[PDB]
Design a protein around this motif. Sequence first.
Motif, PDB file in Angstrom:
ATOM      1  N   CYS A   1       0.833  -1.195   0.000  1.00  0.00           N
ATOM      2  CA  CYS A   1       0.000   0.000   0.000  1.00  0.00           C
ATOM      3  C   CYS A   1       0.871   1.250   0.000  1.00  0.00           C
ATOM      4  O   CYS A   1       1.943   1.283   0.613  1.00  0.00           O
ATOM      5  CB  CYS A   1      -0.936   0.004   1.210  1.00  0.00           C
ATOM      6  SG  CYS A   1      -0.197   0.601   2.749  1.00  0.00           S
ATOM      7  N   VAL A   2       0.410   2.281  -0.707  1.00  0.00           N
ATOM      8  CA  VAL A   2       1.153   3.529  -0.821  1.00  0.00           C
ATOM      9  C   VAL A   2       0.167   4.630  -1.177  1.00  0.00           C
ATOM     10  O   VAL A   2      -0.853   4.383  -1.826  1.00  0.00           O
ATOM     11  CB  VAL A   2       2.293   3.409  -1.866  1.00  0.00           C
ATOM     12  CG1 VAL A   2       1.727   3.313  -3.272  1.00  0.00           C
ATOM     13  CG2 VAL A   2       3.261   4.577  -1.750  1.00  0.00           C
ATOM     14  N   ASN A   3       0.464   5.848  -0.728  1.00  0.00           N
ATOM     15  CA  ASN A   3      -0.367   6.992  -1.072  1.00  0.00           C
ATOM     16  C   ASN A   3      -0.265   7.276  -2.565  1.00  0.00           C
ATOM     17  O   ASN A   3       0.828   7.250  -3.140  1.00  0.00           O
ATOM     18  CB  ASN A   3       0.056   8.219  -0.264  1.00  0.00           C
ATOM     19  CG  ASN A   3       1.564   8.342  -0.138  1.00  0.00           C
ATOM     20  OD1 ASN A   3       2.252   8.649  -1.111  1.00  0.00           O
ATOM     21  ND2 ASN A   3       2.087   8.107   1.063  1.00  0.00           N
TER      22      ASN A   3
END
Lengths: 49, 37
Positions: free
Chosen positions: B2-4
């Motif tokens: 997960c990453v922005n």
Amino acid sequence: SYGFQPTNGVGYQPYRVVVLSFELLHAPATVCGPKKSTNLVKNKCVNFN
Amino acid sequence: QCVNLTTRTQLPPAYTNSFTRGVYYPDKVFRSSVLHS
Ligand SMILES: *[C@@H]1O[C@H](CO)[C@@H](O)[C@H](O)[C@H]1NC(C)=O
């Protein structure tokens, strides 16, 4: 927490309680009693369950 | 993993009309030719 003792408390003994919440008059039932079924005779004034 | 998500270009809100899609069948019953409310 409360001090669950074998017999020192005398009263206030533990009580294992389970509560059942049936739901009636709904979608076809998944749980019923042990009563068995019979035929489905038609064109006759019969009782039905 | 997960990453922005970068390059998140802000956008103005969009609106529309609900028209005639807002209901369902309240119960498991075959009421037919009835005007039940
Ligand atoms: C992405 O940004 C959000 C919001 O600050 C933060 O919670 C998250 O940890 C960031 N993810 C990474 C991989 O740096």
